[PDB]
């Protein structure tokens, strides 16, 4: 379509809205221009969701408990408040880990204070203190406790920070109060920020005066990889094959000790900018540690990232970098040879959270596919700044898309494949459009790194080219 045709599509879709919602949603839809550096001239983001329009966003508790803290495997995270939040988010995100669950690791368990009316009316601080004692008795190998506040905690005036300070001092245990109530902010995003500030204030400085860790010039941290389906492990293997030492993973398969060791690294490698740039900026300011953004989706971006990272070190790391590239060249070239002819020219629309809507584009292009529309649930304009150069001219961009908008865009653009989330999946399959979950990877993955590219390619082919898509119309109609 021409830029004018995409613009007319936006305007036609907007016609259904009352004028207040119409004026607002117009600011969150745009035709891409890859020459734009200040995306605020084209699209705005990180604003309130208009009421009643069926946004796909979650809340700050999702961003804090579900995304940042939940994956830390050897701590116990309390969903503090009524029973709903921790139940819907129990084991829904595939932030993989190695441990003995219920004994030294706790990720897929749901610990909660299960608020009843007595707790609303009289406060939950006494319940939280008792709960902490019971956690300590029944799970003695936990290495710390986080308190993830649900909606009512702030509203009823509870003081979880003083419970955390008093109990933590009494039990000589790290107890992290997180004020991530779902009414805060406008999306998962403020949950990320609240969660990094809680790491900063309660955990990260614990070894500031401890010099016993022997650092090396090759020490790095993987910042902002939650190890979905093993994503961080298939990233870590390449960095260590290239000669670096990965001191910490934030936070997929992450431990509380490797978070506390992270101020000792020489370089923070940031994959999810949206969720972790806050603590990355903090460690630059407090410890002088530089951070750099990278991309391990598909061979082109992975190779570019390995070389960019290696250039910060020395010739020995650069020599290993080229050896890693040489090792995996026949593998991803074989993936391309098998699957690119099956996918050449196919057109995809994406809708995801805060990183992947731009960050997987290169992997699709490595298989000859075209991303004709993309957008984010909760990105900010610095994310859109990084997006516009990655998307083609006259492609469609949507921020905090409504269910109506996304359905209407899809019906006009008619992509060959949609990559989005579980609340979207079954809508579009019924329209006969192949769909891949780009959060959970549709229970597949990893997708990061060279080993992940093979799985990504296999997955896009098995779904886009599946025989089921030719069968939706009955032969008598």
């Amino acid at each position: 379509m021409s830029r004018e045709e995409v613009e007319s599509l936006i305007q036609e879709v907007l016609e259904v809205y009352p004028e207040k919602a119409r004026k607002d949603r117009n600011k969150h839809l745009a035709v891409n221009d890859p020459a734009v550096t200040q995306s605020k001239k084209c699209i705005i983001s990180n604003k309130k969701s208009q009421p009643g329009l069926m946004t796909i966003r979650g809340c700050a508790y999702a961003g804090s408990k579900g995304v940042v803290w939940g994956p830390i495997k050897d701590m116990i995270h309390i969903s503090h408040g009524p029973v709903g939040c921790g139940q819907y988010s129990r084991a829904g995100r595939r932030n993989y880990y190695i441990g003995t669950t219920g004994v030294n690791a706790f990720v897929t368990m749901n610990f909660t204070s299960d608020f009843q009316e007595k707790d609303i009316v009289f406060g939950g601080d006494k319940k939280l203190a008792k709960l902490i004692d019971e956690v300590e008795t029944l799970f003695p190998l936990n290495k710390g406790i986080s308190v993830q506040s649900e909606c009512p905690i702030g509203l009823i005036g509870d003081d979880i920070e003083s419970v955390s300070k008093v109990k933590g001092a009494e039990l000589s245990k790290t107890i992290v109060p997180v004020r991530c109530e779902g009414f805060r902010g406008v999306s998962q995003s403020l949950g990320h920020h609240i969660a990094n500030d809680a790491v900063r204030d309660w955990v990260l400085g614990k070894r500031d005066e401890d010099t016993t860790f022997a650092s090396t010039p090759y020490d790095v941290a993987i910042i902002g990889d939650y190890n979905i389906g093993g994503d961080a492990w298939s990233s870590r293997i390449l960095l260590e094959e290239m000669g670096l030492r990965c001191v910490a993973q934030w936070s997929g398969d992450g431990s509380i000790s490797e978070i506390e060791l992270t101020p000792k690294v020489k370089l923070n490698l940031v994959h999810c900018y949206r969720s972790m740039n806050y603590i990355s900026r903090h460690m630059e300011e407090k410890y002088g540690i530089p951070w750099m953004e990278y991309n391990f989706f598909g061979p082109t971006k992975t190779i570019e990232s390995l070389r960019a990272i290696a250039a910060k070190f020395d010739e020995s790391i650069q020599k290993k970098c080229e050896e890693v590239i040489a090792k995996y060249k026949p593998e991803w070239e074989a993936v391309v040879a098998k699957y690119r002819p099956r996918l050449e020219g196919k057109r995809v629309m994406l809708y995801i959270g805060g990183l992947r809507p731009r960050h997987v584009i290169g992997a699709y292009e490595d298989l000859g596919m075209e991303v004709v529309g993309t957008g984010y649930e909760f990105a900010h304009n610095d994310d859109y700044d990084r997006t516009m150069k990655e998307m083609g001219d006259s492609t469609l961009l949507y921020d905090d898309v409504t269910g109506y908008e996304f359905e209407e865009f899809v019906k006009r653009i008619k992509p060959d494949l949609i990559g989005s989330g579980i609340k979207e999946k079954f809508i579009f399959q019924k329209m006969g459009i192949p769909f891949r979950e780009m959060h959970s990877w549709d229970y597949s993955g990893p997708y990061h790194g060279f080993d992940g590219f093979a799985i990504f390619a296999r997955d896009m082919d098995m779904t886009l080219n599946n025989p089921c898509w030719k069968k939706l119309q009955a032969p008598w109609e």
């Binding site: 009643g52 610990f111 649900e150 009512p152 509203l155 298939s234 019924k430 939706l472």
Partner: protein, 522 residues
């Protein structure tokens, strides 16, 4: 590394030696992990009776609950009405979770909106969100009805739903005659089933409270059926099927089958089927009203008895043989329709299956959990089968309900080893299946982690999970099944005896060790 013609996903990719070696280096270098000996020691301790005693002394901590919160049930109830959009006044994170949770169980779209109350609403209340939200919802998704429930934010700050909706109409955000029933659904009271009860009673009030003067009981010659929180499509269907076989005119009040099972024919249908508004307006003219899951329909029962003046029969959930019999007999009594030969034959075919399978089912010991009515129907059928309920857990059950189940157990010699637990969670149940091991668990997908834990102690301690209940996330299309009536009893019976026989086959598969008992015929 990958071989392009045999690509490995996470399992078994990460069992490759280079990944194994890398994960050992990560652990030893940076995780400061407890020694494996200590981990084993503590795991073993968590299987003991000493640990169970400490576990059951919990007063503040809940671990792995077997319940959800009220507005989840409100949304499922709302979905059962024609062209109705579930609308949860409050904070939007809740609606993302409700939709996703049902998405994963039904593998279907789940349509529901929020009005996205934020910090501003926390200070000023959510009236503006309600006015704009109702206007935006109706314009965009064109429902014929919006059924309003609440998140816990809106409950804590005390939003006046009735005033907000009335002001939305008085100020022209929605037409005065547009139907907007509502219910308060506080997550800190009861559970998801309570939210279903509250939402249904709100919709029933909306269409009948002020129009009772022209109503006459029995004048439409139908029987109302209220299903409650129901997540098996076969359970809606078997009830309609049986009533239709008897020629009984009925009205199923909240009927989400169609919208939870649309075809993949090239069109997305946001709405499909459902109870009509006219069916609710006319429901007081029914002969009577039958509650399929009475133990979470108490508020609905009070309204139907007190306002519609229906003499709601004292019936258990129609699960198992006796209670399906009683259900059909009561329906026959109210409607005047005889029980037809087709259902009599179906009944005898269930009894036949019971005679065929009784030797494998006899004395088998089960742990089980779920919602109150489901659990008590399962307990009742297990007793009819000659099985032994041992650990009966209902996290959201109450003392009156426990008294009723204890009486059912006392009436049968197969209940002598059974204990009913209310207010206990799946971390409580995990201890019980270690200290007093049953043969199987009957429960939802969260039971898989109990099975994993028991197997870690040793194969002889493993308690396999039989998936019956909600949510079921790690198998496909079991939501299509049936648990009510004779049909549901036949499916449960078949699943139970074949679970027993599958496990026996596993235990006797070892050649020259145990396969002397690996019989062809069972």
């Amino acid at each position: 590394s990958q071989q392009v013609d045999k690509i490995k996903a996470s399992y078994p990719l990460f069992l490759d030696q280079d990944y194994k070696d890398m994960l050992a280096k990560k652990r030893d270098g940076f995780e400061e992990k407890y020694p494996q000996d200590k981990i084993d020691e503590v795991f073993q301790w968590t299987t003991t009776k000493e640990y169970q005693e400490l576990n059951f002394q919990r007063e503040a901590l809940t671990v792995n609950p077997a319940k959800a919160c009220q507005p989840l049930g409100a949304v499922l109830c709302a979905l059962g009405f024609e062209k109705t959009m579930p609308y949860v006044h409050g904070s939007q994170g809740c609606v993302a979770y409700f939709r996703s949770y049902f998405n994963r169980h039904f593998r279907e779209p789940v349509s529901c909106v929020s009005d996205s109350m934020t910090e501003d609403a926390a200070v000023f209340g959510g009236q503006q969100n309600m006015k704009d939200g109702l206007q935006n919802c109706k314009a965009t998704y064109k429902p014929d009805m919006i059924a309003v429930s609440t998140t816990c934010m809106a409950e804590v700050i005390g939003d006046d739903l009735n005033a907000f909706i009335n002001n939305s109409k008085k100020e022209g955000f929605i037409p005065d005659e547009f139907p907007v029933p509502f219910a308060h659904t506080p997550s800190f009271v009861g559970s998801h089933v309570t939210g279903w009860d509250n939402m249904f009673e709100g919709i029933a009030r909306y269409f009948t409270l002020k129009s009772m003067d022209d109503k006459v009981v029995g004048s439409n010659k139908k029987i109302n059926i209220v299903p409650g929180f129901e997540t098996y499509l076969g359970n809606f269907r078997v009830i309609k099927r049986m009533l239709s076989e008897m020629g009984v005119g009925y009205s199923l009040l909240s009927d989400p089958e169609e919208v939870l099972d649309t075809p993949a024919d090239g069109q997305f249908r946001m709405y499909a089927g459902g109870t009509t508004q006219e069916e609710m307006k006319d429901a007081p003219n029914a002969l009577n009203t039958v509650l399929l899951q009475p133990w979470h329909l108490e508020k609905t029962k009070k309204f139907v008895e007190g306002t519609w003046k229906h003499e709601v029969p004292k019936l258990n959930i129609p699960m198992g043989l006796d209670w399906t019999d009683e259900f059909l007999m009561k329906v026959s009594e109210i409607s005047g329709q005889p029980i037809p030969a087709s259902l009599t034959k179906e009944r005898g075919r269930l009894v036949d299956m019971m005679t065929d399978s009784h030797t494998w089912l006899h004395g088998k010991r089960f742990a089980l959990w779920g919602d109150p009515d489901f659990v008590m129907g399962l307990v009742k059928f297990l007793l009819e089968l000659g099985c032994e309920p041992v650990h009966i857990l209902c996290h959201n059950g109450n003392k009156r309900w426990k008294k009723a189940v204890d009486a059912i157990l006392a009436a049968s010699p197969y209940g002598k080893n059974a204990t009913v637990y209310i207010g206990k969670d799946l971390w409580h149940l995990r201890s019980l299946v270690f200290t007093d091991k049953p043969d199987f668990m009957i429960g939802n997908s969260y039971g898989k982690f109990i099975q994993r834990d028991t197997l870690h102690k040793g194969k002889e301690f493993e308690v396999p999970l039989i998936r019956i209940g909600f949510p079921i996330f790690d198998r496909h299309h079991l939501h299509r099944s049936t648990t009510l009536g004779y049909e549901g009893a036949m499916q449960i019976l078949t699943t139970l005896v074949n679970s027993i026989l599958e496990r026996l086959d596993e235990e006797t598969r070892g050649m020259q060790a145990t396969d002397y008992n690996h019989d062809l015929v069972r």
